[PDB]
């Protein structure tokens, strides 16, 4: 069994092997690379997302959000509240500015303890989850527009033509901005580009213990527990290393530099958090090897997640017994 240890691989990929990009994560597999849950793809030298990022200040955040965190320094949950729009060069002088620039640190290891030491001091404003693009349409490797769409590998593997559509999504973050833990929906694979700026650091559960990590936020998040039987599904919580560590859950750890990608695989619970202003740019994707991880994916049903249009259908094929239940929770 190759990685049994579940450890983060990094892949060089050379420009040949850049050109067939499933054929590269079927290798990235053939490796061992999904037991992790998370794999860092660095490409070739003479690739290129796009030329320059010297003209994307006019880019709009509609809605910016604080993050605003509750509990302990360990423990802790974000909730998002909304914020006025602003522009992506205005955003990048609010990173900067003296409220919520990074502090001075020696190296990402000081940064990271500064991090979950003082996380829920501080309200960073991250604009998320944005429909758009900035890889060049002459890109023809590895540009996250032009991936084969997840409704198209359902209709290949099942036989069934589905409504739905699947598009990427770009992030602009700064110091402590952060994503909670969670897996994608149904359990995709995401992959993500950091177009520029500071790092990403990231944490991440094997899927083959993905449920350790479920019992030990019911443990303690008890009142969301109660609530909902797959509230990481809400992406609100937080659990730092050092905790996750106290109760013994496997994880990893690593930070994405901008040039870099990294893949999430099925049931690779990720959280993270970036270290100052930054641009990345993610969507989820498909594989043969991920249907069964779709028909087994929890469902929240108490409304609180409210998803995308594209999940109906994936839900209606895969999970039709649940399919009543979920969309009252969309209704
Ligand atoms: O970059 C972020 O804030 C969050 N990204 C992801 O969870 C991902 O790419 O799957
Ligand atoms: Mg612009
Ligand atoms: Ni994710
Ligand atoms: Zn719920």
Same mark, same amino acid.
Request: with cysteine.
């Given at each position: 069994?190759?990685?049994?240890?579940?450890?983060?691989?990094?892949?060089?990929?050379?420009?040949?092997?850049?050109?067939?990009?499933?054929?590269?994560?079927?290798?990235?597999?053939?490796?061992?690379?999904? $037991?992790?849950?998370?794999?860092?793809?660095?490409?070739?030298?003479?690739?290129?997302?796009?030329?320059?990022?010297?003209?994307?200040?006019?880019?709009?955040?509609?809605?910016?959000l604080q993050q605003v965190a509750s509990g302990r320094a360990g423990v802790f949950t974000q909730y998002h509240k909304?914020?006025?729009?602003?522009?992506?060069?205005?955003?990048?002088?609010?990173?900067?500015?003296?409220?919520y620039?990074?502090?001075?640190?020696?190296?990402?290891?000081?940064?990271?303890?500064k991090y979950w030491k003082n996380r829920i001091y501080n309200s960073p404003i991250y604009?998320?989850?944005?429909?758009?693009?900035?890889?060049?349409?002459?890109?023809?490797?590895?540009?996250? =527009?032009?991936?084969?769409?997840?409704?198209?590998?359902?209709?290949?593997? /099942?036989?069934?033509?589905?409504?739905?559509?699947?598009?990427?999504?770009?992030?602009?973050?700064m110091w402590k901005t952060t994503f909670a833990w969670?897996?994608?929906?149904?359990?995709?694979?995401?992959?993500?580009?950091?177009?520029?700026?500071?790092?990403?650091?990231?944490?991440?559960?094997?899927?083959?213990? =993905?449920?350790?990590?479920?019992?030990?936020? $019911?443990?303690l998040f008890? =009142?969301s527990?109660?609530?909902?039987?797959?509230?990481?599904?809400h992406k609100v919580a937080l659990i730092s290393?050092?905790v996750?560590?106290?109760? =013994?859950?496997?994880?990893?750890?690593?930070?994405?530099?901008?040039?870099?990608?990294?893949?999430?695989?099925?049931?690779?619970?990720?959280a993270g958090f970036?270290?100052?202003?930054? /641009?990345?740019?993610?969507?989820?994707?498909?594989?043969?090897?991920?249907?069964?991880?779709?028909?087994?994916?929890?469902? /929240?049903?108490?409304?609180?997640? $409210?998803?995308?249009?594209?999940?109906?259908?994936?839900?209606?094929?895969?999970?039709?017994?649940?399919?009543?239940?979920?969309?009252?929770?969309?209704?």
């Amino acid at each position: 069994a190759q990685n049994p240890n579940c450890n983060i691989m990094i892949f060089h990929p050379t420009k040949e092997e850049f050109n067939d990009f499933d054929k590269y994560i079927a290798y990235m597999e053939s490796q061992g690379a999904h $037991r992790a849950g998370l794999a860092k793809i660095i490409p070739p030298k003479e690739w290129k997302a796009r030329e320059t990022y010297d003209n994307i200040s006019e880019i709009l955040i509609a809605t910016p959000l604080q993050q605003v965190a509750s509990g302990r320094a360990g423990v802790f949950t974000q909730y998002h509240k909304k914020k006025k729009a602003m522009t992506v060069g205005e955003y990048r002088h609010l990173a900067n500015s003296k409220k919520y620039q990074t502090p001075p640190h020696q190296n990402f290891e000081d940064l990271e303890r500064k991090y979950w030491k003082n996380r829920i001091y501080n309200s960073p404003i991250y604009g998320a989850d944005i429909s758009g693009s900035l890889f060049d349409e002459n890109t023809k490797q590895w540009n996250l =527009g032009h991936l084969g769409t997840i409704q198209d590998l359902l209709e290949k593997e /099942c036989g069934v033509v589905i409504e739905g559509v699947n598009t990427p999504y770009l992030y602009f973050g700064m110091w402590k901005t952060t994503f909670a833990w969670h897996t994608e929906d149904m359990d995709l694979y995401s992959i993500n580009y950091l177009h520029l700026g500071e790092p990403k650091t990231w944490y991440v559960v094997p899927p083959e213990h =993905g449920q350790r990590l479920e019992r030990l936020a $019911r443990e303690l998040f008890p =009142g969301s527990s109660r609530g909902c039987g797959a509230f990481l599904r809400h992406k609100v919580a937080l659990i730092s290393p050092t905790v996750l560590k106290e109760n =013994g859950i496997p994880f990893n750890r690593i930070t994405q530099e901008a040039g870099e990608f990294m893949v999430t695989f099925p049931y690779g619970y990720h959280a993270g958090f970036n270290h100052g202003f930054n /641009c990345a740019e993610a969507i989820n994707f498909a594989t043969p090897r991920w249907i069964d991880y779709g028909k087994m994916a929890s469902q /929240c049903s108490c409304g609180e997640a $409210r998803v995308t249009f594209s999940m109906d259908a994936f839900v209606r094929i895969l999970q039709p017994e649940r399919y009543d239940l979920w969309k009252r929770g969309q209704d």
